[PDB]
Amino acid sequence: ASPAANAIAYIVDGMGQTQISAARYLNAYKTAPERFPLNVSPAETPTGFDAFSSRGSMTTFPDDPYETTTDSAAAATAFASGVKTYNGAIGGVQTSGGGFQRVDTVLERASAQGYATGLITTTEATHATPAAFAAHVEDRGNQTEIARQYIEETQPDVILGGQRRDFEADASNGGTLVDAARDNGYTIAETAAELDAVDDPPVLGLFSQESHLDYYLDRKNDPENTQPNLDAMVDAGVDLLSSAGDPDKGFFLLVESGRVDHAGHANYPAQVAEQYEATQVAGQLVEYAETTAEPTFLVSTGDHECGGLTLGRDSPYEVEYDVLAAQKATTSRLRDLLAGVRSADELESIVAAHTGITALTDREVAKLRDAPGSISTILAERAGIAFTTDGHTGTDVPVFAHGPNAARFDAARDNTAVADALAAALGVSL
Amino acid sequence: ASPAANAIAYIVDGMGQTQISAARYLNAYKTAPERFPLNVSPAETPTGFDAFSSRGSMTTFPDDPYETTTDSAAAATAFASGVKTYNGAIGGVQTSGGGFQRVDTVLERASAQGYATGLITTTEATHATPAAFAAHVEDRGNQTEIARQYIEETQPDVILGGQRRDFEADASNGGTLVDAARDNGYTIAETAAELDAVDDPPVLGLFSQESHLDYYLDRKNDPENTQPNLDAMVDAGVDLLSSAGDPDKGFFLLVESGRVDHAGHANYPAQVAEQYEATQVAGQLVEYAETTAEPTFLVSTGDHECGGLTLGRDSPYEVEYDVLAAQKATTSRLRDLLAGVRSADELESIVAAHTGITALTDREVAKLRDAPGSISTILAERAGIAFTTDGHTGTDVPVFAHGPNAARFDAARDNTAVADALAAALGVSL
Ligand SMILES: [Cl-]
Ligand SMILES: [Cl-]
Ligand SMILES: [Cl-]
Ligand SMILES: [Cl-]
Ligand SMILES: [Cl-]
Ligand SMILES: [Cl-]
Ligand SMILES: [Cl-]
Ligand SMILES: [Cl-]
Ligand SMILES: [Cl-]
Ligand SMILES: [Cl-]
Ligand SMILES: [Cl-]
Ligand SMILES: [Cl-]
Ligand SMILES: [Mg+2]
Ligand SMILES: [Mg+2]
Ligand SMILES: [Mg+2]
Ligand SMILES: [Mg+2]
Ligand SMILES: [Mg+2]
Ligand SMILES: [Mg+2]
Ligand SMILES: [Mg+2]
Ligand SMILES: [Mg+2]
Ligand SMILES: [Mg+2]
Ligand SMILES: [Mg+2]
Ligand code: NA
Ligand SMILES: [Zn+2]
Ligand SMILES: [Zn+2]
Ligand SMILES: [Zn+2]
Ligand SMILES: [Zn+2]
C-alpha cells in the first residue's frame, strides 16, 4: 500500500508569510485583548498552521515568456502536475515542437487508482486553482470548457464552489451541464441548507449564480447570506468522500480558500479576516488527519502573495488590531450599504453598525459620501497596514505538511514539489 | 558534555521572508541570466539558508507599553536572555516592583563556563544587537556605557564592528577605553589589513571612526574602502575563538549582518544586495559547522522585517532583477558621487559607471541634479520593487537552525526560543 489512504492539498490563494502573521495577531487579539500581544507567542496560542508538523518555504515563479511572478493557473498546474508552465495555462504546457500539450494531474491519477476525489473552493468552481486539478485548457478564461471537462471527463465526486452560470452552458448532448451532471448521478446544492440535505455523493455545489462566494466577513455577518462557510464545505466534503471499503484507498481532496487573493487585489483590509478563516480551516484539516484510521497526508501553501501587504504603514511601530477585529463587513458589502447615503449621521450610523468605528471625521464623511469604496483606505489607515500593489508579488511563501513523509518539507522546495509529494503519498505515477 | 562545543547566533537585522526571497532571485540571476528564473528553484540553485537543516517561523513582538512592533534592542534581549522586554532595553527588563533589572545573557553564562566568546557586526560595535549579548543598559542610546561594559566587565575575546568614537570615552581609570582594552591584552585593528595581521586574541576591531561599516556594495566596489567584509570578519573571528584545549568548550559567537535594516529604513534598493551578502555568510557558517571536530549548533533569524519591502510595485507581475544585479554603488555612495554635478552628460556618466543604467531620461537628470538621493527611488522604480514604511513591520520572520537539536526549530517559535536553544546547546543555565 502507499504511505497514505487520504491526501489533501490545501491552497490559500494569495497567502504569504505576512498574511499568515496578520491573522496570527488578529487571533491573539480576539482571544485575549488584555494579554495582547504577549499571547501571540506560538507557545501560548497555537494557530491552525502551527498544528502542522513540518514547514518550509516554496518558490512560486512560472515558466512565462514575460512575467517573473506567477498567476494562479501556472502555480496550480505546478501543484497538480509537477511542471512549470506559462501564466494562464491550466493543466498543460506550451511545447516548442507541438503547441499546447496536456499534462496529467494528481487528481486524475488518484481517480484511476480508485481514490474518491474532490474540489472545494470559495471562488467560482471553474477558477484557475481547482481547474488545474481537473481540466486542461490553453487559457484559464475558458470557464465553460473547464466546466464541461469537470462534468463530462474528469467527474470529481465532490465539486463545491461558486458560479452556476458556467454549468448552464451547453453539454455535448441534451441540455446544460447541470443536466449532464444530474444524468451522471450528481445532486445539485445551491445553499448551505441544501448542502446539509445531500444524502449521497456525487455532489455539485454551486453557491452563487455568478462570480465567487462572498468574503468570510460577509458570509458570517450578513443575515441574508445562504452560502456555506469553508469549514462546513470541508466537513460535508470529507464525509462524502470517505466510505467503508478501501482501507488503503481513501480520497484525494483539493481545498482552496481563494479570496485572500481577491482582497489583496482590491487592497481590502478584510484580507486579514479572510486569512483568519483560512488558518482556522488549516487547523480543522490537521484535526481530521489525526483522527483517520489510515494515514492522511496534508500539504498546504499559498500559490503566491497578493497585494504586497505589510504590517506597518509609513513610519510607526504599531498596528491597530482592534480595527480589524471589530470589522463585521468587508468594503464590498459596505459599498452596497452606503450607496446613495448623503447624511453624515446616517453614514456614521451605518459604519458604526458594521465596524468598531464610533465617530467619523468630517473628512471621512466626505470620502464615503463621494465614494463608499474609499472605506477600504479609511480602514487600512486606521489599522496601520499597507499594500504596495494591486497585483501579485514574487516572494517565496510558506509550505506546511503533515502525515507520512511530512519532514521532506522542512526545506526550501519548488512549487512543483507539491505534486510529487501528493503522488508519493497516494502511490501514483505523475 | 553539552550537545555542542560551539554555538553561533547569526542575526540579520531587518530580514524577513521577502528580503530572503529577493536575494534568492538576485543570486539566481547573477549565476545564469539565460536560465533565469527557472534556476531559482532550490533544487537547482541552493542558497546559504537552504544549507540549514531546519527552518521555522518566529514571532518578534516586544513587551512594550505602546509599540506592537519590536526594535532591535528588545529583540536581541530576547535572543540573548530569553525574556521579552520594552523597545530600547538592552540586557534587562522593567519590573513593576523595582525599575530596570539586569538579566543574564547566554554570552556571559558561556564565558563563565570557559567558552571563548565573540561579537562580530557590520554596525557600530555598541549598537543594540551585539550590546544585548554583552551589556546592560536601560536605554540603547547609552553607547559609551555599553563600550565600558564590553571592555571592563564582559570582555568578549573578539569584538568586531564600527565606531571607534565610543571607545574613546573615559575608562574608569587612566585613559580611554581603547587604553583599557590594550591594558587587558586586546590588539586594536582599524582596517582589513590590520585585522589580517592580528596574531593572537583578544581583538577589538573598530573599522570606522564614527557610525557603521559601509554597505556591502560600497565595501566591495569603492577602491578607497579599507574595511573587511563580513565573510572575512567571520573567518578571522572563528580562527581566533577556536584553539586546542576543550574539546567540549569551543566558543559562543554572535554574528550580525546589521545593515539590511538600515537599507530598509532608507528605502534603498541595495537592501537586496546587502541581504545577498548576508545569505552568503549564512552558507559560510553552515560550511564551518560541518567541518568542526566537535558539534556546532547554529541558529539564524531576523530580529524583525524592515521597510515593508515587496517584490512588485503598483501592478505588474514582473521584477527587473538586472537593475539590482548591475548596481555597484548604494544610494549613500551615489549621493557623494553626484553631489554638485549639474551637467546631464556628467550625471549620466557617473550613473553609468556605477549601475546598469546606460541612458537617463531628462526627468531623471532633473531629479538627480536637484537631489542625488532621489536615485534610490529611480532605482526602486526601474527594479519594480516597493517599500511601505521607513520603520519596522510586525511580520513573523524565518528562523534557521543546524546541528544538534536543530529540528526543534521545524516549528513556529517565539524569539525567546533562540536564547533557550543556545543555552541548551552550550549546556548553561539561562
Ligand atoms: Cl494504496
Ligand atoms: Cl477533454
Ligand atoms: Cl438536484
Ligand atoms: Cl475591507
Ligand atoms: Cl479606529
Ligand atoms: Cl524541490
Ligand atoms: Cl560541555
Ligand atoms: Cl556593570
Ligand atoms: Cl594595538
Ligand atoms: Cl540603494
Ligand atoms: Cl533599467
Ligand atoms: Cl517557543
Ligand atoms: Mg493508499
Ligand atoms: Mg485561486
Ligand atoms: Mg462518509
Ligand atoms: Mg520614521
Ligand atoms: Mg496603538
Ligand atoms: Mg560543550
Ligand atoms: Mg542590529
Ligand atoms: Mg584558531
Ligand atoms: Mg493591476
Ligand atoms: Mg521585465
Ligand atoms: Na521546517
Ligand atoms: Zn493566486
Ligand atoms: Zn490574484
Ligand atoms: Zn533591527
Ligand atoms: Zn531598524
PDB file of C-alpha atoms and ligand atoms in Angstrom, chain B residues 1-7 113 115 246-251 294-295 424-427, ligand 18:
ATOM      1  CA  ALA B   1      29.300  17.252  27.953  1.00  0.00           C
ATOM      2  CA  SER B   2      26.737  19.520  26.322  1.00  0.00           C
ATOM      3  CA  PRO B   3      25.274  18.822  22.832  1.00  0.00           C
ATOM      4  CA  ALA B   4      27.635  21.298  21.141  1.00  0.00           C
ATOM      5  CA  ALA B   5      31.186  22.580  21.565  1.00  0.00           C
ATOM      6  CA  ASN B   6      30.465  25.755  19.563  1.00  0.00           C
ATOM      7  CA  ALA B   7      27.279  27.801  19.239  1.00  0.00           C
ATOM      8  CA  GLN B 113      31.872  28.030  31.783  1.00  0.00           C
ATOM      9  CA  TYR B 115      33.750  29.049  26.242  1.00  0.00           C
ATOM     10  CA  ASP B 246      38.496  21.930  25.191  1.00  0.00           C
ATOM     11  CA  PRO B 247      37.358  19.796  23.133  1.00  0.00           C
ATOM     12  CA  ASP B 248      33.906  20.270  24.763  1.00  0.00           C
ATOM     13  CA  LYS B 249      34.442  24.050  25.240  1.00  0.00           C
ATOM     14  CA  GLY B 250      34.707  25.825  21.958  1.00  0.00           C
ATOM     15  CA  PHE B 251      33.105  29.228  21.569  1.00  0.00           C
ATOM     16  CA  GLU B 294      33.006  18.542  17.867  1.00  0.00           C
ATOM     17  CA  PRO B 295      29.409  19.504  17.139  1.00  0.00           C
ATOM     18  CA  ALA B 424      20.794  24.099  25.797  1.00  0.00           C
ATOM     19  CA  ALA B 425      23.442  23.703  23.129  1.00  0.00           C
ATOM     20  CA  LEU B 426      26.252  25.044  25.362  1.00  0.00           C
ATOM     21  CA  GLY B 427      24.896  23.342  28.478  1.00  0.00           C
TER      22      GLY B 427
HETATM   23 MG    MG C  18      30.068  21.920  25.147  1.00  0.00          MG
END
